[PDB]
């Protein structure tokens, strides 16, 4: 329900009360941004145009789900203590451990948010943007917050489990709706079946894969027609039922049995169709890892990628080579904002994922950069006195940005999270942080006394007593 052209989101002021007619004279439209993000104002200095138009900033999030999400991410932030930054020799090993954990913490907070947004039925637009974010993070996690510069051999189960998650959560496909479009209205012999079967295999959806076979041609056409291939197709199904997800060793042995099986069938009695014959050799080749064939039955670059890792060679040493083969086969779909940021992850350049995420959600983007700086994937290179620029890290920037943004949100519950981010900012002079708070604080939306205390307590903690002169000088004039 939103559309960009000039890179900007174009939107209507009012749905059935827009004051300007394209035929009409050119008019003096005026707009004042308000202290409250959700409360701005547009008006016109012209005759018979005396209506005031309260406007709210496009894509603003006032939801409770969000302020919960923000609070939740702020915990994970201050809880990383010193691990928020990047410097026993296990200091390295333990750092990574507590960080790769905060990453799982984030993914959770976000999955929870996503889930809650799904239940209320406001703009589907926000739910979509958020899910894309999660997918991008799901990729980021798999590629950098599991093996810590190691190889899939170090932690196979965590990796493969995470990889399969990212893949089968990016796009709903193959959606069960399509699976049953391949069954209704001679005898599942057209590619549609195999393309779907191999597709499930490439995606690691073996559970489902075996299910599709056990729905048609296995027990009848085979068991009756050719006995040679019946065995092949069945004890291959058996091999799927036991695809090694934990042991890197069991895999090697596994792939051996897979290849041994295809070699046997490959040169044997063909008592079945000339076509059905090949369809099964292609099925057996995909499982074996034949790149040629993996690319063939791949509908998207990422199914190619997932498959190479799952069946060919599980080593991120070929990640770059895998990506290229996969992209030649099927280019990147620019429809969805997530596919590219993932190609960027898998290929190294991680900074170029931020802008995109800052677009989907300023919040998630800020903390994503934060965790990336913690992990040491991105770092400042830079070389009066305040910093809210490219000067300190990129992550610093986004966090302070999101901080500032929170101040106009009008949610007093998030004001601590705001001042907090500025306080705990990995970089930036203490006096720099002082000045910033000196100006942002007068704007705290205090209601209760407790609030005024928290408020004043910060003037103390930062030596902004002069800011308290004003808190009082005001308090005196408020009653009056």
């Amino acid at each position: 329900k939103r559309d960009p052209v000039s890179g900007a989101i174009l939107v209507p002021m009012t749905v059935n009360d827009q004051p300007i007619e394209k035929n009409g004279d050119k008019m003096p439209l005026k707009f004042k941004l308000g202290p409250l993000s959700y409360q701005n104002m547009a008006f016109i200095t012209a005759k018979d145009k005396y209506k005031l138009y309260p406007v709210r900033i496009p894509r603003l999030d006032t939801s409770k789900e969000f302020s919960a999400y923000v609070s939740g991410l702020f915990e994970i932030y201050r809880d990383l203590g010193d691990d928020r930054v990047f410097n026993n020799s296990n200091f390295a090993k333990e750092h990574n451990a507590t960080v790769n954990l905060a990453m799982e913490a984030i993914l959770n907070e976000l999955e929870v948010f996503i889930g809650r947004v799904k239940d209320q039925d406001g703009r589907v637009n926000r739910f979509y943007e958020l899910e894309e974010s999660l997918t991008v993070l799901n990729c980021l996690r798999t590629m950098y917050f599991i093996l810590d510069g190691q190889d899939v051999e170090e932690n196979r189960s965590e990796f493969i489990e995470s990889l399969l998650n990212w893949i089968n959560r990016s796009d709903g496909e193959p959606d069960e709706e399509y699976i049953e479009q391949v069954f209704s209205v001679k005898v599942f012999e057209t590619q549609y079946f195999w393309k779907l079967l191999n597709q499930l295999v490439l995606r690691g959806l073996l559970s489902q894969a075996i299910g599709c076979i056990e729905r048609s041609d296995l027990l009848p056409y085979l068991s009756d027609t050719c006995a040679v291939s019946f065995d092949a197709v069945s004890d291959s199904i058996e091999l799927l039922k036991q695809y090694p997800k934990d042991s890197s060793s069991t895999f090697r042995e596994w792939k051996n049995l897979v290849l041994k099986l295809s070699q046997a069938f490959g040169s044997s009695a063909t008592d079945i169709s000339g076509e059905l014959r090949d369809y099964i050799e292609d099925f057996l080749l995909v499982i074996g890892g034949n790149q040629r064939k993996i690319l063939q039955y791949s509908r998207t670059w990422y199914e190619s990628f997932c498959g190479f890792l799952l069946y060919y060679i599980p080593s991120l040493e070929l990640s770059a080579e895998y990506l290229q083969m996969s992209l030649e086969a099927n280019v990147v779909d620019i429809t969805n904002d997530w596919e590219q940021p993932c190609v960027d992850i898998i290929s190294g350049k991680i900074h170029s994922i931020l802008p995109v995420m800052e677009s989907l959600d300023s919040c998630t983007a800020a903390f994503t950069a934060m965790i990336c700086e913690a992990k040491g994937l991105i770092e400042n290179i830079f070389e009066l006195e305040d910093l809210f620029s490219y000067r300190n890290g990129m992550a610093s920037y986004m966090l302070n940005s999101f901080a500032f943004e929170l101040c106009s949100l009008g949610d007093k519950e998030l004001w601590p999270v705001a001042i907090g981010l500025i306080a705990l900012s990995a970089t930036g002079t203490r006096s720099a942080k002082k000045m910033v708070i000196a100006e942002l604080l007068p704007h705290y939306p205090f209601v209760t006394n407790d609030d005024i205390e928290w408020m004043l307590s910060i003037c103390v903690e930062w030596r902004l007593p002069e800011i308290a002169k004003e808190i009082y000088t005001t308090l005196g004039n408020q009653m009056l």
Partner: protein
């Protein structure tokens, strides 16, 4: 977000927000000032009070810091600036809920603008009119809000289509200074070490009448940012850095409006910039990592 009726007979010139954005002050040529409140439970703007404040078009208006109380200032074509203070001992919509604190009438020409100075400089204000004379007024004794002293006078232009604008520098951590636009000119005044005002710089490039200029809050930075909307169809964002003598750059320049850019305003945090014009559209701009401004969204009043 349904539009509401201001209730003005003639044309509305300015609309201004109080400190918390929960209130709005409005002035029209119908010689009336209105104040609306955003009811918390209904989330509908309702009229707090309205009254005849001037004997001619009330072009500009502005609120003082909560710190000094409920104070509003209004500039009018009747060559006068008036100051009002909410007297809560009067019913709302009683026409008598705001009291005139005083009437500054030193101006000899219609008044186009009136802006209160950042609270950190005390109860101070500035106005500009036909007589091309800038004027600062101080409530030297906040004990009594009726006595305002003429703190300064400066001839912005030499000889009296004409527009004028004012916008102080918000930052409390920066030398007192304000921006002034007269016709096509745009100059900055800085408080000299001698206590007087001095022309510290100029914003060049404007090829015709400057309709609006807004100095951005500089929370977080070492430089100042002041945007202008010119009749020549361009939004211009100037970066002023003092190294004190002021160094001036032209960060961004946008023509997206194709037609006069009538109003330019800044965020509370000076994170977002707004522009409105003939094209009947309002665009919002944030700054990139390299400090060039990109347009983040476009709201249209066009049918």
């Amino acid at each position: 977000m349904q539009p509401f009726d201001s209730g003005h007979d003639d044309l509305v010139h300015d609309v201004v927000y109080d400190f918390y954005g929960r209130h709005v002050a409005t002035c029209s040529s119908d010689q009336h000032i209105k104040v609306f409140k955003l009811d918390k439970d209904t989330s509908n703007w309702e009229l707090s009070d309205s009254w005849r404040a001037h004997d001619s078009s009330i072009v500009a208006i502005d609120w003082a810091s909560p710190e000094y109380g409920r104070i509003i200032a209004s500039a009018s074509y009747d060559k006068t600036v008036k100051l009002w203070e909410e007297d809560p001992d009067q019913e709302e919509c009683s026409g008598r809920r705001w009291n005139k604190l005083c009437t500054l009438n030193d101006s000899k020409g219609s008044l186009y603008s009136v802006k209160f100075a950042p609270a950190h400089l005390g109860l101070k204000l500035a106005c500009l009119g036909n007589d091309g004379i800038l004027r600062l007024y101080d409530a030297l004794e906040p004990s009594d809000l009726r006595s305002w002293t003429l703190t300064s006078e400066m001839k912005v232009l030499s000889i009296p289509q004409s527009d004028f604008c004012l916008s102080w520098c918000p930052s409390r951590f920066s030398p007192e200074k304000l921006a002034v636009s007269a016709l096509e000119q745009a100059i900055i005044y800085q408080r000299g070490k001698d206590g007087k005002l001095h022309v510290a710089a100029k914003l060049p490039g404007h090829k015709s009448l400057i309709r609006s200029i807004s100095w951005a809050p500089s929370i977080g930075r070492w430089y100042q940012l002041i945007a202008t909307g010119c009749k020549d169809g361009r939004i211009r964002i100037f970066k002023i850095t003092e190294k004190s003598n002021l160094q001036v750059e032209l960060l961004s320049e946008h023509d997206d409006h194709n037609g006069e850019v009538w109003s330019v305003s800044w965020n509370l945090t000076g994170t977002i910039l707004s522009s409105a014009g003939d094209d009947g559209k309002v665009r919002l701009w944030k700054a990139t990592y390299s400090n060039e401004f990109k347009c983040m969204s476009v709201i249209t009043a066009q049918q």
